[PDB]
Symmetry: C3
Subunit: 313 residues, 3 copies
């Protein structure tokens, strides 16, 4: 019968292509509840100085977002007082006391102007004197590179996801009594459940240079995808790891990532601070997920729609 072959072709076209490829027989949940616990390990050395994780990882609480400091411009022994203003500030440069007016407070400056013209930190120029945190970084900062051994650092990312509808839970570390998580190196295939990543590895998979990113700074995403079919065993629900840079790489106006922080002390009853401008690599751990599980209602509805299409066709 010609109709036999015609309908055999029609059915298979709308069966193997509708209920198989796109899984019309499944209800879905997009976006699981996730916990990210992070921990960085590794120590680096500058000139007669050893840096530990506490110093170069900020914030310290071990969450999804953190910055590993690779370079600092540090200004020591900063106290409230009078000092020459940065030559980089508008109208700062002066030739006589008459060129500076008292009380003026530029937002982009570094204090309140005194009405005097004082010699700059490095001569021979002169610059308007201000009251504020002194000395200013643009005249007393020292640079330290502490990203020399940062490619050898290690980050442990612990993730556990939950799909409330399906009541499904899976983590990225296996229940193993041996010391696997202490002698293991992540491999997307052989060691997918050792979620310990070197920073150099992460920077290689984002397609970036460790040197450029260590001097200007930047942001690298670590993306974990949980695309699981629950009609199958939980052993098939596994994490997929992706590494890409998130911040612009061609923007010349703002090229990189940086932040300032200070350390406050009291020397002889005077509040003193060391200001640090930190360039570093920020690590975003972003978690995506999509679970699918058989449900009778959607299956029946889609079967009815397919039967209607067959009847029309």
């Amino acid at each position: 019968v010609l109709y036999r072959a015609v309908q055999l072709l029609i059915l298979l076209y709308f069966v193997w292509y509708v209920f198989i490829v796109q899984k019309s027989y499944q209800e879905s949940e997009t976006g699981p509840e996730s916990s990210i616990i992070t921990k960085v390990k590794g120590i680096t050395t500058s000139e007669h100085k050893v840096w530990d994780v506490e110093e170069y990882v900020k914030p310290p609480e071990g969450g999804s977002v953190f910055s590993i400091i690779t370079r600092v411009e540090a200004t020591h022994s900063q106290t409230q007082g009078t000092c020459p203003e940065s030559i980089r500030v508008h109208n700062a440069t002066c030739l006589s006391d008459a060129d500076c007016v008292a009380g003026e407070l530029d937002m982009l400056g570094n204090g309140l102007r005194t009405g005097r013209c004082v010699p700059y930190y490095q001569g021979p120029s002169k610059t308007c004197e201000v009251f504020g945190w002194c000395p200013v970084e643009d005249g007393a900062s020292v640079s330290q590179f502490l990203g020399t051994m940062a490619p050898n650092f290690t980050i442990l990312i612990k993730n556990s996801i939950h799909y409330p509808k399906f009541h499904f839970s899976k983590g990225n570390i296996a229940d193993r009594t041996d010391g696997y998580l202490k002698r293991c190196t992540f491999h997307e295939a052989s060691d997918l459940y050792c979620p310990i990543f070197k920073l150099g590895f992460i920077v290689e998979k984002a397609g970036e240079s460790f040197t450029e990113l260590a001097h200007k700074g930047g942001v690298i995403g670590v993306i974990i995808n949980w695309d699981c079919d629950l009609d199958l065993p939980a052993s098939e629900c596994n994490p997929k790891y992706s590494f890409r840079r998130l911040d612009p790489k061609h923007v010349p106006a703002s090229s990189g990532y940086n932040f300032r922080f200070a350390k406050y002390y009291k020397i002889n009853g005077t509040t003193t601070r060391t200001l640090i401008k930190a360039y570093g690599i920020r690590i975003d751990v972003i978690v995506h997920g999509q679970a699918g599980k058989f449900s009778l209602i959607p299956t029946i509805i889609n079967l009815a729609t397919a039967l209607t299409s067959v009847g029309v066709g």
Copy 2:
């Protein structure tokens, strides 16, 4: 032919209204990967005191969420020791040593009770003595307003989005060799790609008063929407900026935003701290996005559905 006009009307109704208005010929991705780098600039003065960004912006790392401090209640020279308890604490007020019992520890109090009744910081009342961080803020705090020039502060928000499916990337700062990002003021039309916002501007677009929000505190969202049609040039994919308050504005029980933080020192071998209760404006940078790009599969499926509807009709 009457059928000619009938079908001409029917088709246009389900063509210009189905594949044009709602763009049935497009696959979509909702929710891009985003990076937010923030930086606040501006300095403010209190009584013989200049405040910089490091002091009034917390946390300092330059992310999506940060608080600009506008007012502080500060308690200086706090040490572990004995002091009268706040008159604001239940059962704290006493007339004789018999009214206070030793060892009691109220969670809403400020230390461990000693069993004695001592004069309050400001007379003539008496209050039960406690062991803890002393003196208590409700008896030794001084208030400082540092939001006087906060409307003139500036926030630079750098955003770059990524749609992995489409492999589309766009940022909110243009590749310009000139010093545009150094002499530019955001304008939703003329300067949409100078993402430098004054706080006063943000507070005007949220419909709020800077004074009320500076004394009680609050939360303002900065919403960036990326609604892009990829069938068009990337020059059509642009950010849309919105400013609205996120926290309740009529709640009298909890009206505002505040947090406490302390600064720890060691004076003569004794751990001493200055406790700061900070009221301020928290800035949430929230990023929404929806990209659409032509795909043949959805177009064919929707065309088949439209043809079926036409056939029935």
Copy 3:
């Protein structure tokens, strides 16, 4: 008429089951803009020491994610210098100076090796000497439990959601002139709008033991669901609170949550720090929401589809 009863049955089956149960007459927005302001209250005591919220809550800014410290391993008077390395570090243990080689820098160690073998902190063993932050925690740390009264702590979670499409806004605290938010205890039914939760309560609703979670640490999600039908009064749009643990509870390799932070001082011109390893309970406040409101377009489209199905059937 038989057809009368047949169509009466058919219609009700596809009316009470299509436009009622699944609300086909509604357009939807999934995912509202939310603000979370948190504040923890409660003080705890260790041996001759009173801890306040500033010490045990990190970070302090009052956001969606924060950690309440329950146990610390603290190492005091740490200075850059030479000290024996932790016996827990590979190859650290030595019998003579020849077993240690100078310059070697293990990432999992605690400094730079000097080439000498020195007695360990606790005898009789000997371990290779390193330069770094000294002494090392594994030889000078003291443990403090400060989770004794943590179940009695209180967390105030303030939430306000916004659905931009519907321009709908609702918060979780009512506009009440009385002191309700000062004498109230959350009850999912009687006091759903007192969003002040004890930590013990939260840990009881997650199904966990406060002791196990206080010594190893962990992560508890506080989930707020806003499932609102806008065709009804705003008094029907209410929060639904759920409490569940987010981190794995059977993983032996990594069981818990911890982070390290340090406190920096200057004693006699020398930078000195107290390193704290903190175990605690991290609180994730996660907000889900789904609003539905009548729209004519979807209603007409779904009615047309239902009529087509009826005609075919």
